[PDB]
Coordinates of C-alpha atoms in Angstrom, one line a residue:
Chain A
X208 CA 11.7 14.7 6.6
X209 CA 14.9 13.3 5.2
X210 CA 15.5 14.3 1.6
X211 CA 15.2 11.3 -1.3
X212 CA 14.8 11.5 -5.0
X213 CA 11.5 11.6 -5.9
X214 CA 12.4 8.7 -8.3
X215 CA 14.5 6.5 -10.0
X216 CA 15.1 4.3 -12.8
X217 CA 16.9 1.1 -13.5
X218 CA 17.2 -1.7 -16.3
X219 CA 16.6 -5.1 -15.6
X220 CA 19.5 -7.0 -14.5
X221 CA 21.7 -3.3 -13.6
X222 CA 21.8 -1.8 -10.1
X223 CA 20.4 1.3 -8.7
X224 CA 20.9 3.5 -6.3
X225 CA 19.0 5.8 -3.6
X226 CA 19.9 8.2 -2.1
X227 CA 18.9 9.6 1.7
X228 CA 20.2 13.1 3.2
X229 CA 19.7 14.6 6.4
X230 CA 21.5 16.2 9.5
X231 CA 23.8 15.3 12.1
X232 CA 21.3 14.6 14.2
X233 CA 19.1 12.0 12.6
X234 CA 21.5 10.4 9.4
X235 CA 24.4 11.2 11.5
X236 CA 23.8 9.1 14.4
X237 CA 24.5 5.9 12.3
X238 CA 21.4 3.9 12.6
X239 CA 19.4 4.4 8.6
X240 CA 16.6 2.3 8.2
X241 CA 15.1 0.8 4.8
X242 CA 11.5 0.2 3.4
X243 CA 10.2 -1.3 1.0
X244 CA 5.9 -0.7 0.0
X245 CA 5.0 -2.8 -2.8
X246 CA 1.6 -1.4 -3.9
X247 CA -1.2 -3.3 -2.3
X248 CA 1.6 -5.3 -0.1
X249 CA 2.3 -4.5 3.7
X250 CA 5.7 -2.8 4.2
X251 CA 9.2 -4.4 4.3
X252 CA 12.0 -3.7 6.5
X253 CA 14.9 -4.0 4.0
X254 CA 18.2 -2.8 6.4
X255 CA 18.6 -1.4 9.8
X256 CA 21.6 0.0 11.4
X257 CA 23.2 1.4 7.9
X258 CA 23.7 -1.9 6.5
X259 CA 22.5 -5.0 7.9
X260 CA 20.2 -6.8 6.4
X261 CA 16.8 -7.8 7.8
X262 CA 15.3 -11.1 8.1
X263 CA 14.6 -12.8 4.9
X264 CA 16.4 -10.0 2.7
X265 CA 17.9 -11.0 -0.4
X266 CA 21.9 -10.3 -0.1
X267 CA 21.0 -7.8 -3.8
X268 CA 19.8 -4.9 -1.5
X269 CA 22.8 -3.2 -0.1
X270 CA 22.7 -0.4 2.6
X271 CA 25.2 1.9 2.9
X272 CA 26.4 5.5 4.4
X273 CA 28.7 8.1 4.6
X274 CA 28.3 11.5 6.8
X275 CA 24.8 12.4 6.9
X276 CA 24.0 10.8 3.6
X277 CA 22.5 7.4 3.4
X278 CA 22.3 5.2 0.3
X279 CA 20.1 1.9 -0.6
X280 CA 21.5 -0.2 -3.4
X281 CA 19.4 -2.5 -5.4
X282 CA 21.6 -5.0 -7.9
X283 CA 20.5 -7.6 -10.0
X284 CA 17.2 -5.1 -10.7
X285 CA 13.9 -7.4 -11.4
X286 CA 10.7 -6.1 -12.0
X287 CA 8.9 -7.0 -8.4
X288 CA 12.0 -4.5 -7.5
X289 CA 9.8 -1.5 -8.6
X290 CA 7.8 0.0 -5.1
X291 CA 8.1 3.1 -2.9
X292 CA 11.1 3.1 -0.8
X293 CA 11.9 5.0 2.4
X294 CA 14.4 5.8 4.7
X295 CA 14.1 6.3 8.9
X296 CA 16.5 7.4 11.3
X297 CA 15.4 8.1 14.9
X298 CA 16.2 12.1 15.7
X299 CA 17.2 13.0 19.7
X300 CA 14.9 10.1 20.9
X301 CA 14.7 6.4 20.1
X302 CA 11.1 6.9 20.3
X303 CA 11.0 10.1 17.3
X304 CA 11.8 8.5 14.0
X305 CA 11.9 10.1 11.2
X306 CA 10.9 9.1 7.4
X307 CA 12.6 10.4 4.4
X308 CA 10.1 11.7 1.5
X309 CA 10.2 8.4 -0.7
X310 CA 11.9 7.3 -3.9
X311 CA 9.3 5.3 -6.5
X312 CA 11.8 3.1 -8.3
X313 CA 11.2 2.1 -12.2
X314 CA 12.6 -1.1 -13.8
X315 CA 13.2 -0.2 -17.2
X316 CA 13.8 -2.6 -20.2
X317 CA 10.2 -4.6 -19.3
X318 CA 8.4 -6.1 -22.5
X319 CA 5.5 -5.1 -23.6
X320 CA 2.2 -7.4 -22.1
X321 CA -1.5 -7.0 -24.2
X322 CA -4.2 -6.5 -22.4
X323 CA -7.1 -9.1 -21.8
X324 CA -10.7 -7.9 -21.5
X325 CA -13.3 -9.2 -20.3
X326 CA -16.4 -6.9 -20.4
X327 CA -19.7 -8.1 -18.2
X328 CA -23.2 -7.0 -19.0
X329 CA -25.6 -6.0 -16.6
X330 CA -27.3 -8.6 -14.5
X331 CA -31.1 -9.5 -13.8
X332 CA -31.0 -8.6 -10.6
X333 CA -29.6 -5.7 -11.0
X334 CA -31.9 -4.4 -13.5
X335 CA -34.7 -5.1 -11.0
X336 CA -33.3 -3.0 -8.6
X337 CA -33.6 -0.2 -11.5
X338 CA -30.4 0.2 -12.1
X339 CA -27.6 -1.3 -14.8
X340 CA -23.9 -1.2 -14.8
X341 CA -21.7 -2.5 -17.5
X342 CA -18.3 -3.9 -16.1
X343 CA -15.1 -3.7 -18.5
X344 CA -12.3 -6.0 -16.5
X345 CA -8.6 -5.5 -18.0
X346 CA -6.3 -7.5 -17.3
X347 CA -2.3 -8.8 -18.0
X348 CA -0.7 -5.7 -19.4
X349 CA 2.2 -3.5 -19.2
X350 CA 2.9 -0.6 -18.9
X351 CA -0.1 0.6 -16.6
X352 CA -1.5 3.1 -18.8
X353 CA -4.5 2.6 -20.7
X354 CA -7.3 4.5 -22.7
X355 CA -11.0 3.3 -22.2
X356 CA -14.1 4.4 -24.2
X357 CA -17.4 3.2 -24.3
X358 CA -20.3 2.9 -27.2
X359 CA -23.3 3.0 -27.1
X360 CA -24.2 0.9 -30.3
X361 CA -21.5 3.2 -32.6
X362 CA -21.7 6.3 -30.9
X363 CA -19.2 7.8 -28.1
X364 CA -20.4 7.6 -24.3
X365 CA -18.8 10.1 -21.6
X366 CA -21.5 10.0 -19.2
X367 CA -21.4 7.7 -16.6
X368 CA -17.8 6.1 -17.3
X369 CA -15.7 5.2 -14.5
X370 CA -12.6 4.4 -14.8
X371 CA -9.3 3.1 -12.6
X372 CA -5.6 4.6 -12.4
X373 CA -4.3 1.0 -13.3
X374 CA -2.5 -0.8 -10.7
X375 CA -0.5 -3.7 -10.4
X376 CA -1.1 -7.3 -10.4
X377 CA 1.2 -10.4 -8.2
X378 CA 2.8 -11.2 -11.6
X379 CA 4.2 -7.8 -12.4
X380 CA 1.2 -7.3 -14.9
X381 CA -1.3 -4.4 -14.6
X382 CA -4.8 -4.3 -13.7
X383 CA -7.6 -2.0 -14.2
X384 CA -11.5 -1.9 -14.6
X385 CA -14.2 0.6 -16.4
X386 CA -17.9 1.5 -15.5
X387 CA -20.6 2.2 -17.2
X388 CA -24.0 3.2 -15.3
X389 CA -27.0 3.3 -17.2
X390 CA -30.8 3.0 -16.6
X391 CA -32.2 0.1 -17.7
X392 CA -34.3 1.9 -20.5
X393 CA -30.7 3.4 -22.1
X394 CA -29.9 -0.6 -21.7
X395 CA -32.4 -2.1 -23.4
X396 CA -33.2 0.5 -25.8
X397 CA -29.8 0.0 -27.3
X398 CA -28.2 -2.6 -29.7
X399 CA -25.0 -3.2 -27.9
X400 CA -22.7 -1.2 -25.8
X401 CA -18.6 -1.6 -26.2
X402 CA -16.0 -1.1 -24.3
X403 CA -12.9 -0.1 -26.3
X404 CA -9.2 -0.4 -24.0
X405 CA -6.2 1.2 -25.8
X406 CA -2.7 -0.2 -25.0
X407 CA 0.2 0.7 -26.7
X408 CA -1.6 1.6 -29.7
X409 CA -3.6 -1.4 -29.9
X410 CA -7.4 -1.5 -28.9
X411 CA -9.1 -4.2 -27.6
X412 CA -12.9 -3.8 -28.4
X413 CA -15.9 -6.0 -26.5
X414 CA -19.2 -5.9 -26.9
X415 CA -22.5 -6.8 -24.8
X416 CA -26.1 -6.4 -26.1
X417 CA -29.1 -6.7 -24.1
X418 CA -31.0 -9.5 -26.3
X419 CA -28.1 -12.0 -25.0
X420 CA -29.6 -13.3 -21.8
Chain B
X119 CA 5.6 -16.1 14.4
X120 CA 5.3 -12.6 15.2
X121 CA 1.6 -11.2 14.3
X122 CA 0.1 -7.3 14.4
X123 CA -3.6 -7.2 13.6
X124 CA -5.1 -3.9 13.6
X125 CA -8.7 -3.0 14.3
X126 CA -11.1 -0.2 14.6
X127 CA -13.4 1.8 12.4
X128 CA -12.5 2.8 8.7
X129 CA -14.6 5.8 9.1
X130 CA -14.2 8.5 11.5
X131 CA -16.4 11.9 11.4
X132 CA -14.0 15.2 11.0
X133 CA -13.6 16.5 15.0
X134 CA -14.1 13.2 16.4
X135 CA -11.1 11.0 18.0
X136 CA -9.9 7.6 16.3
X137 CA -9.2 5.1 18.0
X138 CA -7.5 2.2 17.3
X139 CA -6.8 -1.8 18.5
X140 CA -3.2 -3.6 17.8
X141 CA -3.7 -7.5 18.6
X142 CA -0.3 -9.1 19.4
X143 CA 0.6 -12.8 18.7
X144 CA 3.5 -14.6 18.4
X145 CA 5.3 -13.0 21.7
X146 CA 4.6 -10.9 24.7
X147 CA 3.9 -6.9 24.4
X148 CA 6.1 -6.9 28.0
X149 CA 9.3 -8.0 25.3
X150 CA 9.1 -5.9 22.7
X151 CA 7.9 -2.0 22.2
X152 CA 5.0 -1.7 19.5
X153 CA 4.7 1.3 17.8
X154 CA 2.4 3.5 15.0
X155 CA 2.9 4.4 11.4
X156 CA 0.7 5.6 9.0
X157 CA 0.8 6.4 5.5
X158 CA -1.6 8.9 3.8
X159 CA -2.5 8.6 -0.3
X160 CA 0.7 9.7 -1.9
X161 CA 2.5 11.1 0.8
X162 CA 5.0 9.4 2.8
X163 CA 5.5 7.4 5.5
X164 CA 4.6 9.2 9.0
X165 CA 5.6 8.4 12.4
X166 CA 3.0 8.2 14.8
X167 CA 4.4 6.9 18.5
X168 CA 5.6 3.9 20.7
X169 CA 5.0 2.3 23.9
X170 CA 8.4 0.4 25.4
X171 CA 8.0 -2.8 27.3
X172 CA 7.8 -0.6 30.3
X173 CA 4.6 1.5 29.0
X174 CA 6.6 4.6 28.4
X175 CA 5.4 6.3 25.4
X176 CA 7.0 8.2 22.8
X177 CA 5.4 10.9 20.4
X178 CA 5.8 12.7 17.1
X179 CA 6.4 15.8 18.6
X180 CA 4.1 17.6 15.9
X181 CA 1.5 15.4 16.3
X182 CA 1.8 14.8 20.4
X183 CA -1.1 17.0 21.3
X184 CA -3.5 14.6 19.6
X185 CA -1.8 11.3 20.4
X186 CA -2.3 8.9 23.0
X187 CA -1.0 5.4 23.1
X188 CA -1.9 2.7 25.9
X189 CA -0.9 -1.0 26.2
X190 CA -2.6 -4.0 28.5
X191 CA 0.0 -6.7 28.5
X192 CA -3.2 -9.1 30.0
X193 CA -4.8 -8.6 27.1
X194 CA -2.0 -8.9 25.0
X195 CA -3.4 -5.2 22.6
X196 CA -1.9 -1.6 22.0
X197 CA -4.1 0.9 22.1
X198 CA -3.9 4.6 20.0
X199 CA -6.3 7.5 20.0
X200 CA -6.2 10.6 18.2
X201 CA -8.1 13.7 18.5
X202 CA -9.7 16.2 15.8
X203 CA -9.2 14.2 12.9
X204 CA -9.3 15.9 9.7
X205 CA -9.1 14.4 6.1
X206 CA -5.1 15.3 6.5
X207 CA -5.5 11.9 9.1
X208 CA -7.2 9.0 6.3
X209 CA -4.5 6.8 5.9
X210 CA -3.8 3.3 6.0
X211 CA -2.7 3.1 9.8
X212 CA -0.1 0.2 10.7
X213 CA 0.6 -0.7 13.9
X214 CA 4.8 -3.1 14.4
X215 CA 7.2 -3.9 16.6
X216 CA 9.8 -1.5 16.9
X217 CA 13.8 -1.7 17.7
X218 CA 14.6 1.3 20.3
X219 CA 17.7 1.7 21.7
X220 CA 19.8 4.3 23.2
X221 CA 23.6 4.2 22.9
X222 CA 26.6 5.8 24.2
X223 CA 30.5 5.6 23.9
X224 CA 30.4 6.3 19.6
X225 CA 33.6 8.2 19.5
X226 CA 34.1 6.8 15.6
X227 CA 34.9 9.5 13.5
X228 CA 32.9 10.1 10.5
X229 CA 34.2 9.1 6.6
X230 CA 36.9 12.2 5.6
X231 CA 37.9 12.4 9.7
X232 CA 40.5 10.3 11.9
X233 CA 40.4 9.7 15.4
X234 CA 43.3 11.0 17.1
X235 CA 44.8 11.7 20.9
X236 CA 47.3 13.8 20.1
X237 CA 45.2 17.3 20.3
X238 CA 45.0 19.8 22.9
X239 CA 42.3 18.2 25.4
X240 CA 42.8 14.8 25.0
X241 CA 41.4 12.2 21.8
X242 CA 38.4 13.6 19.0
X243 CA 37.9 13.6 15.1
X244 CA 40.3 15.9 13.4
X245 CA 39.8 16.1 9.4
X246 CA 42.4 13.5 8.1
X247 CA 43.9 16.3 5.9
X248 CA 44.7 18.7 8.9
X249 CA 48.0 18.9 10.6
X250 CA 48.7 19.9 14.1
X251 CA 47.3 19.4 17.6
X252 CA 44.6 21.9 17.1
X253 CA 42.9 20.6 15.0
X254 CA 40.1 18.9 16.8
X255 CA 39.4 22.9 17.3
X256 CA 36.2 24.2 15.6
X257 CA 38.2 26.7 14.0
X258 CA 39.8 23.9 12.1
X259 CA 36.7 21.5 11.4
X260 CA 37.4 19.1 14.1
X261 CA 36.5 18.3 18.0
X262 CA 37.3 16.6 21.2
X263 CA 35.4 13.6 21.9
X264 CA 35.0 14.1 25.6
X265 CA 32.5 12.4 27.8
X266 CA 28.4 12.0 26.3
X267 CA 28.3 10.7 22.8
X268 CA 24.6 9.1 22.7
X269 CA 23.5 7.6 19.9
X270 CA 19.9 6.7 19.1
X271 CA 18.4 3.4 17.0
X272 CA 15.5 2.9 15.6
X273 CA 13.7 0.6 13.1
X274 CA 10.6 -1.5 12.7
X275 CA 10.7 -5.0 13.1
X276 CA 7.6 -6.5 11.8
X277 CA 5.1 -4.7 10.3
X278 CA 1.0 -5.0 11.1
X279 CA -0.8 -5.4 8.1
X280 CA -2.5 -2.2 8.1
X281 CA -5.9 -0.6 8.6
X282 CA -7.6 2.0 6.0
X283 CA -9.1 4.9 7.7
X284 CA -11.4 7.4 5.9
X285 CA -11.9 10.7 7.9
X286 CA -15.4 12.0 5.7
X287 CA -18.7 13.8 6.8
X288 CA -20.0 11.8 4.0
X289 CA -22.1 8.7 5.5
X290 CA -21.7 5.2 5.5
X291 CA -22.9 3.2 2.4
X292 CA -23.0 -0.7 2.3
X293 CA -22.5 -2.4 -1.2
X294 CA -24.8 -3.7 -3.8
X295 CA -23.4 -7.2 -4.8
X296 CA -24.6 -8.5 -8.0
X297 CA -23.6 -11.6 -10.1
X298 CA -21.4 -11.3 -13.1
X299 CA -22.1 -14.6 -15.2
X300 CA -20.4 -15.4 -18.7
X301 CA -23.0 -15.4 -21.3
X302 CA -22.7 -18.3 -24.7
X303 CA -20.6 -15.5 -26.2
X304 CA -18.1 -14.5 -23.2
X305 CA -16.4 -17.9 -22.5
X306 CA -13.0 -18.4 -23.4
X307 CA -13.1 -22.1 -24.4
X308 CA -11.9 -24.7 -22.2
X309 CA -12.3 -21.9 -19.3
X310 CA -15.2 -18.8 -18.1
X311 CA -14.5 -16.0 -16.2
X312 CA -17.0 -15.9 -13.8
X313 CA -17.7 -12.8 -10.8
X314 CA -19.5 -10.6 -8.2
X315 CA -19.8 -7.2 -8.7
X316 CA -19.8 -4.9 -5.7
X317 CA -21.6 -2.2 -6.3
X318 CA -21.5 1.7 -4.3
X319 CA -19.9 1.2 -0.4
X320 CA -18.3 3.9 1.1
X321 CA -15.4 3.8 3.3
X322 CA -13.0 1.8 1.6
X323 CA -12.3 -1.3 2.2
X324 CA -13.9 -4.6 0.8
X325 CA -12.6 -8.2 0.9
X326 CA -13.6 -11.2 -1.7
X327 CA -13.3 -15.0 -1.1
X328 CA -14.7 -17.6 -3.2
X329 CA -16.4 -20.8 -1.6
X330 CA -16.0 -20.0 2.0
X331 CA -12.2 -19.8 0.8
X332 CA -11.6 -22.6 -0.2
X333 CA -11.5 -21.3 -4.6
X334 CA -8.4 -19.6 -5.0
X335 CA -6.6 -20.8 -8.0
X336 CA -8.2 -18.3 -11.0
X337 CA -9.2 -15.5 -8.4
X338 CA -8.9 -12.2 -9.4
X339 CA -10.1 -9.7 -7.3
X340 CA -9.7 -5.9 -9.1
X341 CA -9.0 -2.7 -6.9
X342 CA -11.7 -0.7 -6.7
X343 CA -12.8 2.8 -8.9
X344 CA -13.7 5.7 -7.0
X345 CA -16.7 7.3 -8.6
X346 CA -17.3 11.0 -9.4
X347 CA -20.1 10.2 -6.6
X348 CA -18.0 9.7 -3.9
X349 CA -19.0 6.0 -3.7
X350 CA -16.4 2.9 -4.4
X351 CA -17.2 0.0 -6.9
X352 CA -14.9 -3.2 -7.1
X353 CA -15.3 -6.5 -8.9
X354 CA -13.8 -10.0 -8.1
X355 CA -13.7 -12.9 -10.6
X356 CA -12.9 -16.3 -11.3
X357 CA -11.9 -18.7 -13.8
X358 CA -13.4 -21.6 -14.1
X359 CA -14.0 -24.9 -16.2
X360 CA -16.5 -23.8 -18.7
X361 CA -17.6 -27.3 -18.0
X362 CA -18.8 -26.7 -14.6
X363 CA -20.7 -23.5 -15.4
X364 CA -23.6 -25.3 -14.7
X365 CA -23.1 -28.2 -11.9
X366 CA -20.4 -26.6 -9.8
X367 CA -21.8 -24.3 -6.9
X368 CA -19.6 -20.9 -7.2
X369 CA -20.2 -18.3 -4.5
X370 CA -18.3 -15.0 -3.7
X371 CA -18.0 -14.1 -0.1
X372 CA -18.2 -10.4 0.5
X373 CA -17.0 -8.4 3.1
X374 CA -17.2 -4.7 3.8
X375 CA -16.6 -4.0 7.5
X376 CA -17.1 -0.7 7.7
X377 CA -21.0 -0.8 7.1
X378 CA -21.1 -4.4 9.1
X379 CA -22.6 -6.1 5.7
X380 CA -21.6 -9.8 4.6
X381 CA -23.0 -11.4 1.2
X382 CA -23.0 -14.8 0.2
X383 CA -23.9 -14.6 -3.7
X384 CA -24.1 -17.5 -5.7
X385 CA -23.6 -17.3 -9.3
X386 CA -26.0 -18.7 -11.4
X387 CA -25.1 -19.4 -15.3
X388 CA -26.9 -17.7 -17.6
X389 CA -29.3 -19.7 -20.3
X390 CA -28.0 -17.4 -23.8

């Protein structure tokens, strides 16, 4: 495996750099690879051969090397910048490439984004089918960290909450989504259930109660 | 343009062999090699193996034991098995056309060395600081660059768009899908968010369209939680004209592969 930083930070607007070491025999032999893997996306080829640039690369991703050290640098730093990126070099054989460990990049200097929440009860059907799950959608919001808890009426819930690692969205916001699984009795037996999100020291608090229909 | 389509199952038993499909389009497998890469959660990109436009194969030589990769130009598909998976082999699994190339003749000195012919032997990289005609010696840092100097290229072209592959002993579960309509209370004026929920599969993954595809704008389709059960739960949404709630026909299109279910639910709006 070829030795990155595990990661790395740049404002918006600045330039970054990663780094990739090896050996003689893999960084050496003059032919580093780039990729870029946007969560969610497929993989990019970013440079081949130390530094050219593949097909539809912006010129702002630069490739570079010297010795058995290879270097990818990112200028003009935007937020759809941030990803995993990884360096290849084929070692003794065209046909044996080898990956370097992975550098997750962070654009700094982003503005805070609120969330939006949009919390579901649980439908007819479902309840029919004996079962009831209460569906807490947030959406819009950076950074990607966020505190759900749920209420039954006033009082704390901790069984039965699911909840996402928040990931994110095309337009560089986050996105994550919390369960709730209840029987139908704990459903209707209740006067509401809430789902409270927590960004930033903000919450966001919505509310469902089984007399809606 | 140049396509890669992966197929094959998303769940594989632990001790059994997976095997998976590349479908070409876009140009001939008899011009360009194809190649395997696959990516386990959180770790890093792994090379798997390639088969040149002459059907020679290269390996991972870690992983060679368990490999096997075989191409039908006819059929225009690359082929790649491996043996006694364990839960070290769920990945997402891409298949791409790779650049491979051997060269020879690099006698360019690295940075911090100069090419030179005035040593002892003939021309090589001495260390731009030494002095002398020894010094493309080893003693000295340098060498004589005398006959074989092959180089080796690689890099992927274009990439597949990737298959997710579970290796589990826990069994296949198809999704429940239920409707997720926006009460009196839920709208958000001119516009109602509108969605399926889908419910407790297992492997990943699951795909949502609305109308047949043709609903796009307002789609918003949420990765999925993994529950403490083992089971996955995902929802997709919509935004709509609150307007319409009631005389437009709006129907998610689910997809989960892996337990060969499709559901065609409409949402209804609710009366409250």
């Amino acid at each position: 495996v070829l030795n990155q930083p595990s990661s790395v930070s740049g404002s918006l607007g600045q330039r970054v750099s990663i780094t990739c070491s090896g050996s003689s025999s893999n960084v050496g032999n003059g032919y580093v690879s780039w990729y870029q893997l946007i969560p969610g996306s497929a993989p990019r080829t970013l440079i081949y051969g130390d530094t050219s640039r593949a097909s539809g690369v912006p010129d702002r991703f630069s490739g570079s090397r010297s010795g058995n050290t290879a270097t990818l640098t990112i200028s003009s730093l935007q937020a759809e910048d941030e990803a995993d990126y990884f360096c290849a070099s084929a070692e003794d054989s065209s046909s044996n490439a080898v990956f370097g460990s992975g550098t997750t990049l962070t654009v700094l200097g982003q503005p805070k984004a609120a969330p939006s929440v949009t919390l579901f009860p649980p439908s007819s059907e479902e309840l029919q089918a004996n079962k009831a799950t209460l569906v807490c959608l947030i959406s819009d919001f950076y950074p990607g960290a966020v505190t759900v808890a749920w209420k039954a009426d006033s009082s704390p819930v901790k069984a039965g909450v699911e909840t996402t690692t928040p990931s994110k969205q095309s337009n560089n916001k986050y996105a994550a989504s919390s369960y709730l699984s209840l029987t139908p009795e704990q459903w209707k037996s209740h006067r509401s259930y809430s789902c409270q999100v927590t960004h930033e020291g903000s919450t966001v608090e919505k509310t469902v109660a089984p007399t809606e229909c | 343009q140049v396509q890669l389509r992966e197929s094959g199952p998303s769940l594989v038993k632990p001790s059994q062999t997976l095997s998976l499909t590349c479908a070409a389009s876009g140009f001939s497998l008899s011009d360009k090699a194809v190649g395997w890469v696959r990516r386990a959660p959180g770790k890093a990109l792994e090379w798997l193996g390639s088969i040149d436009t002459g059907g020679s194969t290269g390996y991972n030589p870690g992983l060679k034991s368990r490999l096997s990769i075989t191409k039908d130009n006819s059929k225009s598909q690359v082929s790649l098995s491996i043996s006694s998976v364990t839960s070290e082999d769920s990945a997402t699994y891409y298949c791409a056309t790779v650049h491979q190339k051997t060269a020879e003749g690099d006698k360019t000195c690295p940075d911090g060395y100069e090419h030179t012919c005035g040593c002892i032997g003939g021309c090589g990289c001495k260390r731009s600081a030494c002095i002398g005609a020894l010094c493309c010696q080893a003693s000295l840092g340098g060498w004589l660059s005398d006959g074989e100097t092959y180089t080796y290229e690689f890099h992927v072209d274009t990439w597949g768009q990737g298959l997710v592959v579970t290796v589990s002993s826990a069994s296949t579960k198809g999704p429940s899908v239920f409707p997720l309509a926006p009460s009196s209370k839920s709208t958000s004026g001119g516009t109602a968010a509108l969605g399926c929920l889908v419910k407790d599969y297992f492997p990943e993954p699951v795909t949502v369209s609305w109308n047949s595809g043709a609903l796009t704008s307002g789609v918003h389709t949420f990765p999925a939680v993994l529950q403490s059960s083992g089971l996955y739960s995902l929802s997709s949404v919509v935004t709509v004209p609150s307007s319409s709630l009631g005389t437009q026909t709006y129907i998610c299109n689910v997809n989960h592969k892996p337990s060969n279910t499709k559901v065609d639910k409409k949402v209804e709006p609710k009366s409250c």
